[PDB]
Specification:
Order of helices and strands of chain A: EEEEEEEE
Protein name (chains B, C): Avidin
Largest interface: A-B, 54 and 52 residues
Shape of chain A: globular
Family (chains B, C): Belongs to the avidin/streptavidin family.
Function (chains B, C): The biological function of avidin is not known. Forms a strong non-covalent specific complex with biotin (one molecule of biotin per subunit of avidin).
CATH superfamily of chain A: Avidin-like
Distance between the termini of chain A: 18 Å
Oligomer: homotetramer
Strand order of the largest sheet of chain A: 1-2-3-4-5-6-7-8
Keywords (chains B, C): Biotin, Disulfide bond, Glycoprotein, Secreted, Signal
GO molecular function (chains B, C): biotin binding
Largest sheet of chain A: 8 strands, antiparallel, barrel
Strand content of chain A: over 45%
Radius of gyration of chain A: 15 Å
Bound molecules: the ligand O=C(O)CCCC[C@@H]1SC[C@H]2[C@@H]1NC(=O)N2C(=O)OCc1ccccc1, 2-acetamido-2-deoxy-beta-D-glucopyranose
Amino acid sequence: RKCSLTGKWTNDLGSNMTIGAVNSRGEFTGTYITAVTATSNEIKESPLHGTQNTINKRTQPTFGFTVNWKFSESTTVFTGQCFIDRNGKEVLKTMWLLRSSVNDIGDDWKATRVGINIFTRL
Amino acid sequence: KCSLTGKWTNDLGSNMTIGAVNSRGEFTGTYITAVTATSNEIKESPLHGTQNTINKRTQPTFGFTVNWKFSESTTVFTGQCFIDRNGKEVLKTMWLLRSSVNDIGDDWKATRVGINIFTRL
Amino acid sequence: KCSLTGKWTNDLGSNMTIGAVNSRGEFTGTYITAVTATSNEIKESPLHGTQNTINKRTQPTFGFTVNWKFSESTTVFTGQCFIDRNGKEVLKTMWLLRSSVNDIGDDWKATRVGINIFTRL
Amino acid sequence: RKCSLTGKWTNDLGSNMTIGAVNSRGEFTGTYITAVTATSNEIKESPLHGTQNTINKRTQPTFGFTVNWKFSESTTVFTGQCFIDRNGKEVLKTMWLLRSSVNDIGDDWKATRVGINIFTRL
Ligand SMILES: O=C(O)CCCC[C@@H]1SC[C@H]2[C@@H]1NC(=O)N2C(=O)OCc1ccccc1
Ligand SMILES: O=C(O)CCCC[C@@H]1SC[C@H]2[C@@H]1NC(=O)N2C(=O)OCc1ccccc1
Ligand SMILES: O=C(O)CCCC[C@@H]1SC[C@H]2[C@@H]1NC(=O)N2C(=O)OCc1ccccc1
Ligand SMILES: O=C(O)CCCC[C@@H]1SC[C@H]2[C@@H]1NC(=O)N2C(=O)OCc1ccccc1
Ligand SMILES: *[C@@H]1O[C@H](CO)[C@@H](O)[C@H](O)[C@H]1NC(C)=O
Ligand SMILES: *[C@@H]1O[C@H](CO)[C@@H](O)[C@H](O)[C@H]1NC(C)=O
Ligand SMILES: *[C@@H]1O[C@H](CO)[C@@H](O)[C@H](O)[C@H]1NC(C)=O
Ligand SMILES: *[C@@H]1O[C@H](CO)[C@@H](O)[C@H](O)[C@H]1NC(C)=O
């Protein structure tokens, strides 16, 4: 199969994201609803934007996107690869950086968390 | 007041441009890297991202994705735009560079991480 | 009561042993990886690290370094030991694999990052 | 020159660390005094332990170490390479993960920060 980004996905936390169509330059838009937050705020649905790499028209492309959170001053980016898994299902295997806002450039050292996120189609 | 729009460089000698940021915090840009993990000839590549506009912070967070035109890889960057008394700006960012692998059993080795600090041209 | 001492495995089928932990929180262990970024034959390698004992938490953080015997690389792991209802343990860790580069100009590409979840074997 | 880990180092935060002799199995011990913390706690000098890789006895070895902080429940690991810089000085280029203690497994996702640290002698 070719692995496509377009569709509704979910992860183990129960966070969901929807990615729209991917255009000829590899650009896509979507929305992300996170299950969990580092804020003390009400979570809202937040937009994301990114690109899939189309060099050599790989069936399992890499891609990246940015989630522009609407209830926090933070930003997360994700990057990964759209695989066909051993069981034939599409899966997105990604890593992320969550950048918090700090007040002072001397506090920049602690502003970035890292992690993984694995998505399956919902 | 710290704006991402401009031409930027880092110590590695890579440059990036970022254009205007629209009311939804979106922007497009270009990135010309001085270095590569590929043995391919480097080409200028496009980037796209967003600046966070919650509470209209003067030192906003942001992220963008670089869609490399000479490899199968993708890099994302996230960071913050810092600006001092004299209006001098610095973007402090961290990145993940995702390589393509052929088999999902090699996924574990596919992601590099590092920092990039940009200043204006 | 989440203890690191034991034999552990991950989904790649790598295994690790960790022996007794000191009153100083030091431990020694071994790692036999299922996968390598090198083209060399894998060999069992030693590891050394510490568990944090502050407030003697039941679910302590810890870190350790694996000194690979078949490559010029080093990997460090850091995480937390979680234990459930039935006394079932899982170590959730993240790791940086540092490759050797010959020239300092190539340092930017030398560090890979990932996760590893271990269960008792 | 061969790049040696043993000695007293500092970074741009003003954090200092002292590494002792490296033994024949590549092991070393030291102490770390951080300038900053992500906690609301009082900082104290803390021990570190790690190893240098001695495969092919490279003059610029990789290494890793763990700082077992004595004033928080956190752990940081650092890994990197001891280079001789273009100017002939020793420099340790490292990256780190700082693992915070979370109370529950559901919150694991947010417990790891990442960053760089570059050290120079004295
Ligand atoms: O707090 C803010 O400032 C804004 C909101 C940030 C939400 C973060 S983005 C990374 C993480 C969180 N949500 C999510 O789905 N993540 C994620 O890592 O999911 C994958 C996962 C699955 C199972 C277990 C752990 C992580
Ligand atoms: O090879 C591929 O597959 C595609 C090309 C990947 C290019 C990588 S993206 C991160 C790194 C490299 N270029 C660059 O400017 N980076 C960077 O880290 O420079 C940042 C820097 C900032 C401040 C000081 C020193 C270096
Ligand atoms: O090549 C070298 O230079 C020296 C050897 C490096 C081995 C690396 S250390 C991190 C990674 C690899 N082995 C392992 O068990 N890891 C690991 O990530 O396992 C966790 C895992 C579990 C399921 C799926 C993917 C990863
Ligand atoms: O808080 C806790 O939970 C326990 C203590 C953690 C101390 C952290 S470990 C990584 C970081 C901090 N200190 C330090 O020297 N680091 C560091 O990154 O310094 C390098 C640096 C130099 C200049 C600018 C930014 C970073
Ligand atoms: C994910 O979508 C599923 C099914 O539609 C829903 O039950 C779940 O609550 C959603 N997660 C969030 C964070 O909204
Ligand atoms: C960045 O711009 C400078 C000055 O214009 C130029 O000399 C340098 O070659 C550019 N860097 C790259 C990687 O093209
Ligand atoms: C892990 O241990 C099992 C035996 O328990 C063994 O079959 C497997 O080969 C080990 N993995 C490696 C990489 O040695
Ligand atoms: C670093 O060492 C210097 C003495 O050379 C000292 O002034 C400074 O406060 C030390 N840093 C810390 C965090 O104690």
